[PDB]
Amino acid sequence: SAEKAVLEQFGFPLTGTEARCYTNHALSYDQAKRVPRWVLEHISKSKIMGDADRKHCKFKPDPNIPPTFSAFNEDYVGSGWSRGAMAPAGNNKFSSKAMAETFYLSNIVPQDFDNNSGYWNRIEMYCRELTERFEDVWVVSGPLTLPQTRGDGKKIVSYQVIGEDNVAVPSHLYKVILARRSSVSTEPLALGAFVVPNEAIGFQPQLTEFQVSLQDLEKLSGLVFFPHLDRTSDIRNICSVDTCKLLDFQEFTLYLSTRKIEGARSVLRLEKIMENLKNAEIEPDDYFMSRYEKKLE
Amino acid sequence: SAEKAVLEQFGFPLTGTEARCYTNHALSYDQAKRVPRWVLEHISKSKIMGDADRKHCKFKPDPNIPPTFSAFNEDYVGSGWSRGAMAPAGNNKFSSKAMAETFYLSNIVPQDFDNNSGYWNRIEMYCRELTERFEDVWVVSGPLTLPQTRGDGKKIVSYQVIGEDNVAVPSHLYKVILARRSSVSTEPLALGAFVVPNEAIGFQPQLTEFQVSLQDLEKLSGLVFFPHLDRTSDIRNICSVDTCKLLDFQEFTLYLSTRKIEGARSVLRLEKIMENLKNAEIEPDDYFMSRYEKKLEELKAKE
RNA sequence: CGGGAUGUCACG
DNA sequence: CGTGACATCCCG
RNA sequence: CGGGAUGUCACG
DNA sequence: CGTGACATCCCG
Ligand SMILES: [Cl-]
Ligand SMILES: [Mg+2]
Ligand SMILES: [Mg+2]
C-alpha cells in the first residue's frame, strides 16, 4: 500500500470524536458545535447516595479539550441560556471527583432556563428512581438540532449559536434509558428513547408524549446506541414495565422544599419554605415534617 | 477499572467518524447529515492522465455505509441541488476503479448547480494545474454550515435538508491545499485554505477573496488538518509562492471546447463546437486547432 | 472539466 | 422493482 | 434536585 | 487574568 502511505504523509484530519472517559461518565465531544455529542453514564442506588456537595463545584472548561474547540463560561452567562449538564450532578453524590467532572463544559449544553431545572430535571429524577426497581441503569444523553418544515414544503434546520465561540443551542434533547432488573436475571431489558424540545413545558404533558423508537432517534442523531446490545434478543418498552411518569406539581414542589432544608443553615430559611409551601396551596406531607423538626435544632 | 467495564458493558455509542480509505482518497462520513465531513486526496502529473471516463460511471450509495445513514439519488434528483463530488473524478483519470469510488454518495454534497460546474470546478482545475509546478499536492475538501447574524444581533445557523433522508445542504464549502515542490528539496511547503459560499459565482472574484487562515478554518469546521505537519517550521502562503488565479471566461470555455473534441462522434458535431467558440468572440489557440484538425481527420476516414 | 435528460439489450 | 454496458442528446 | 447574583481570604 | 476552597442571598 505505497499509495496509501503518500496519502497519509501528513496525517488524516482529526475530528476529536474519540470517546473521553471520566470517573463516572464518558462522552464524545463535538469540536464544531462546542457541545457533547453523546454522554453515557451508569446509575445505581449505591451512587446516588453520598456527601458530595453541588455548591463546591464550578463550571469550568474541560482541560482535556483543546482551548480552540472548547467553550467557556463567558459564552453562557447572560446569553439568555443556561448551562445544562447531561450527566446529572445528582447521579454522583458518592464521589466528589465524579461530581466535579460533571461540571466540565464538555458535559454541558445550552438549555432553556425553565426546562433545565423544570421538566428535564424531573426526567433526571425519574432515572434515579429506577434504581429502586433495577440494579443497573444506563443513560445516554445529548443535544439535537432538528429540522422543521415550513409553508413552501422544504425543511430547514435552524439553531442559535451564543458567545464568541458560537456554542450551538440545540432545538431538542434526547435521553435513552436501558435498564436491567438484576445482575443474575435474564428478564428482557427495559429500553426507552425520548426527545424533548429545549423550552419550558410544564406539568401537563406526560413523559410518554416525548417517547420515540430507538432506530428513529438513531436516524435523527446519526448515532448507534448500545452496539453490544443483542437486538435479536427480546427487549421491552421501559414504559410497559414501569411508570414513565414524572412528579406532579405537588410532589415536585415538596421534593425541592424537602431538599432545600438540607442546605438551609439559618432558621429563617426554614420559615420562608413553609410560607412558600402555604403560598403553594400544598399540604405538607408528614415526611417533610419529620425532616422539618429534626433540622430545627 | 471495574466501574468502567459496567459503562462499556453495552458499548459506547457509535459515531461512524472513522476514516474510510479508497483507491485515491479517504474521508470521514457524517451519519447525521448524510454527507462527508472531510475528504483527503493526493494528485500528481501521473494521476490526472488516463483513459477513465466519467460517462461510464454512476452515482450510487457507498456500499460500506449502512443504508440507515446513507444518502440515495432519490434525495438529490429533483431537490434543486446538484451532486457535487469533493474528491474530483478528473483527479483520478488513471484508474477506472478510483474514479468510480468518487461517485459514491459518501463523497458527495448538495451543491448549487452553477457553483458545481463553474467556480468550484475552476478551483479543482487550479489544483490539477499545480501539478505542473509541484510534484505532490494534497487537498482536503468538505462542507460547512456557518452562522449568520440577524438584525437583532442573534447568530443563526440555517440550512436546508433535502429528500427523505434529510441530506444537509451546506452554506459554504472549504478546501485546504498543501503542496511540496519536490520530495528531495526542502523549499518551505506552501499552504492555502479557502471557504467559498454554496451559490453561483462568476469570473470576477479572485480565489484570494475566499482565502482564510488555517486556524480560522479549523475553528469553523471543528477539524485539525494535516496533524503531522510541523507548524513551527517555515510554511508559506500558496498565493504568494504561486498564482491563485482561476481561469477567466475565455480560457475556461476554451478548455471545455477542447475536452469536447474527444467526444465528437461526427464531423458535423465537431464543427458545432467551433462555431460556438466563434459565436462567443473567442479565437481558438494553436492547441485547439491541432486537436480540432486531428479529431476532424480521424472522423473523416471512417465516414 | 463539471452537471443533467433519455432510450436499447442482457440478466438477477 | 432492482444490476450491469452500449448508445443519443442538453446545459455552464 | 436544577440553575443564577454577590463577597473575604490564599496562590500561580 | 488565570487556578484551587470558605461563605449568603435570590429563583422554579
Ligand atoms: Cl436534479
Ligand atoms: Mg440540568
Ligand atoms: Mg463538482
Author numbering:
A (entry chain A): 56 to 352
B (entry chain B): 56 to 358
Extract from the study:
ExoG is an evolutionarily conserved 5′-3′ exonuclease in higher eukaryotes that is localized in mitochondria. Compared to its paralog, endonuclease G (EndoG), ExoG contains an additional Wing domain at the C-terminus and bears a signature SRGH sequence (instead of DRGH in EndoG) in its catalytic ββα-metal motif. Here, we report that human mitochondrial Exonuclease G (ExoG) may participate in this particular process by efficiently cleaving at RNA–DNA junctions to remove the 5′-end RNA dinucleotide in an RNA/DNA hybrid duplex. Crystal structures of human ExoG bound respectively with DNA, RNA/DNA hybrid and RNA–DNA chimeric duplexes uncover the underlying structural mechanism of how ExoG specifically recognizes and cleaves at RNA–DNA junctions of a hybrid duplex with an A-form conformation.
